[PDB]
């Protein structure tokens, strides 16, 4: 056959892959972590959005740290040979490097290690996407007026916010980042490479949202999401028939 | 608006 | 006039911008840091590569931590009003979050803060690119067979290696990452959006390089670079006449 | 090959 290029991940396997959504709304009282009003709106929006991208969506609600680890271990041990990609969405409290189960923290490194190129062989060479709506610290952005492959290769972290910063969630509309991510996937998943979709998400969050608070400390604050790419190819959710 |  | 889109940064200002290259090869004996053989090859390759992209390149060699801070402060206080973008390349030892001057460390946060949207007003809304060849830790990748905008917006960090990992430099050929970055910029800067160029860099480093060492600890190791994007638009180094 |  004619000249061939391989600048993009093969996304025409029989299945697009799993979309695991971990939706942590209610936390154990002893942790002192507040309920995350609005996160169900996020979880429902993600379920529909990735359903239309033909992902096999699994929604899990209010998981302990132990349940999060066991779920991700179990998922990593499935046979993904017929799947193009893997997506995990984490909706919870967090700090830098950490996502919270309902009763305590989980290292993000422990979650993502289960999917290393050497530990999940049926996902080696395939994009592994981790989409994280959670705080990364307590900073606030005041804004300004205007033969082998590496085991860490082929991961993408779509973080809702910059390192060190809070992330914003609206109790009625859902989180700024997940709202914007789903809108941009709905509009551009049949049109744009994934990094370009995520860049539109960056602009939408950065330009269309500002916090409103009776507390001057938390009022009029802004947010920029953070794309972390170890991908080795372009990622398009569509393929050519 | 709330923070996570 | 007709329908208008603004999905990409305006790169047709009179000047493309500064390219500051900090090339730290020789360190003060008291620090105990080794000389970085091969880094001059990197610095020369970057100078030529960004010269052909029409950047105003400034090469600085063997700067102390004090000189690095003073240089970046001074650069941030220049009038960039007629410049499209800003590029800083750091070639040195490092650890997570840190680049070394010849006599001690500098927080990357301190360097990049000078260019925040609220602190460098003539670069607000313009892409600020930080390209970092330096270690981020001591891990080794064994590989596997096959109205306001946020102050942190519009930064891009092109890291040579994953968080927590060593980065590899060849004493004769230069660093894996800088070698590959310059090659991909030479080949695709007139063809591809910058995130897609950097993705090709990820694949080139991940597939074409493996360490050779008489020390089994350091032998047969691999590397994946790490793209961190807070950009709000697509970045093309060319523009339409 | 050397590390940084
Ligand atoms: Na958000
Ligand atoms: Na390198």
Question: Which residue ranges form the domains of chain C, and what is each CATH number?
Answer: 1-241 (3.40.50.1460)
Number of helices (H), then strands (E), belonging to chain D: the values are 0, 1
Q: How far is CA A224 from the centre of its chain?
A: 15
Distance between CA atoms of A31 and A81, rounded to whole angstroms?
39
CA distances from C90 to A199, C19, C63, C127, C130 (A): 25, 11, 11, 17, 8
Is residue C138 classed exposed, middle or buried when 0-12, 13-18 and 19+ CB atoms within 10 A define those classes? Answer: exposed
Is residue C209 classed exposed, middle or buried when 0-12, 13-18 and 19+ CB atoms within 10 A define those classes? Answer: buried
**DSSP H or E stretch at residue A47:** helix A39-52
Distance between CA atoms of C215 and C218, rounded to whole angstroms?
6
C232 neighbors A226 (Cβ within 8 angstroms): no
Q: How many CB atoms lie within 10 A of CB C174?
A: 24
C63 neighbors C70 (Cβ within 8 angstroms): no
Q: How many CB atoms lie within 10 A of CB C182?
A: 20
Taking CA atoms, what residue in A is nearest to B1?
A: A170
* C59 DSSP β-pair partners: C21
Chains A and C are in contact, defined as 3 or more C-beta pairs closer than 8 angstroms = yes
Taking CA atoms, what residue in A is nearest to C163?
A: A152
What Rg, from alpha-carbon coordinates, does chain C have?
A: 18
Distance between CA atoms of A110 and A119, rounded to whole angstroms?
12
Q: Tell me which residues of chain A, numbers 78 to 107, contact chain C at a CB-CB cutoff of 8 Å.
A: none
Residue to mutate among C199, C208, C210, with most A CBs inside 10 A, is C199
Q: Is C81 on the interface with D (CB under 8 A)?
A: no
C48 C-alpha to ligand 2 centroid (Å): 18
Q: How was this structure determined?
A: X-ray
Closest CA–CA distance from residue B3 to any residue of chain A (Å):
5
Q: What is the stated resolution of the deposited model, in angstroms?
A: 1.7
Query: Nearest Cα to C160, choosing from C189, C112, C202?
Result: C202
Distance between CA atoms of A68 and A61, rounded to whole angstroms?
10
Sequential DSSP letters for chain C: -------B----SSEEEEEEEEE-----GGGTPPP-TTHHHHHHHHHHHHHHTT-EEEEEES--HHHHHHHHHHHHHS--TTEEEEEEEEES-EETTEEEETTEEEEHHHHHHTT-TTT-GGGTTS-EEEEEES--SSB-B--EE--EE-TTTTEEEEESS-TTB--EEETTTEEHHHHHHHHHHHHHTTTS-HHHHHHHHHHHHHHH-----SSGGGTT-B---EEEE--SSB--S----
C61 C-alpha to ligand 1 centroid (Å): 41
Could you tell me the strand order of the sheet in which A174-175 lies? A174-175, A168-170, B2-3
**Alpha helices per DSSP H over A81-193:** 108-113, 176-188
Q: How far is CA C107 from the centre of its chain?
A: 15
B4 C-alpha to ligand 1 centroid (Å): 8
Distance between CA atoms of A160 and A203, rounded to whole angstroms?
12
Q: How many CB atoms lie within 10 A of CB C231?
A: 25
Q: How many CB atoms lie within 10 A of CB A14?
A: 8
- 3-state SS, one letter per residue, for C74-93: HHHHCCCCCEEEEEEEEECC
Q: What is the largest CA-CA distance in chain D?
A: 10
Collapse the DSSP code of A175 into the 3-class scheme (helix H, G, I; strand E, B; otherwise coil) and give the result.
strand
Contact between A211 and B4 using a beta-carbon 8 Å cutoff = no
């Amino acid at each position: 056959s004619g000249i061939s290029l391989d600048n993009s991940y093969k996304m025409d396997y029989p299945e697009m892959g799993l979309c695991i959504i971990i939706n942590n709304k209610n936390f154990h009282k002893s942790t002192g972590m507040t309920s995350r009003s609005g996160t169900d709106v996020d979880a429902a929006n993600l379920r529909e959005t990735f359903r239309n991208l033909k992902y096999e969506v699994r929604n899990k609600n209010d998981l302990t740290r132990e349940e999060i680890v066991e779920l991700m271990r179990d998922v990593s041990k499935e046979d993904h040979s017929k799947r193009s990609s893997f997506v995990c969405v984490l909706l919870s409290h967090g700090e830098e490097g950490i996502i919270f189960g309902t009763n305590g923290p989980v290292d993000l490194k422990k979650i993502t290690n289960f999917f290393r190129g050497d530990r999940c062989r049926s996902l080696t060479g395939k994009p592994k996407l981790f989409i994280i709506q959670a705080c990364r610290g307590t900073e606030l952005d005041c804004g300004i007026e205007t033969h082998k492959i590496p085991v860490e290769a082929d991961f993408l972290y779509a973080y809702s916010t910059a390192p060190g910063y809070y992330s914003w969630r609206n109790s009625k509309d859902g989180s700024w980042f997940i709202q914007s991510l789903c809108a941009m996937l709905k509009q551009y998943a049949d049109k744009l490479e994934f990094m370009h979709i995520l860049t539109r998400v960056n602009r939408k969050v950065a330009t269309e949202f500002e916090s409103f608070s009776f507390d001057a400390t938390f009022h009029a604050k802004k947010q920029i999401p953070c794309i972390i790419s170890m991908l080795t190819k372009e990622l398009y959710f569509y393929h050519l028939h | 608006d709330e923070v996570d």
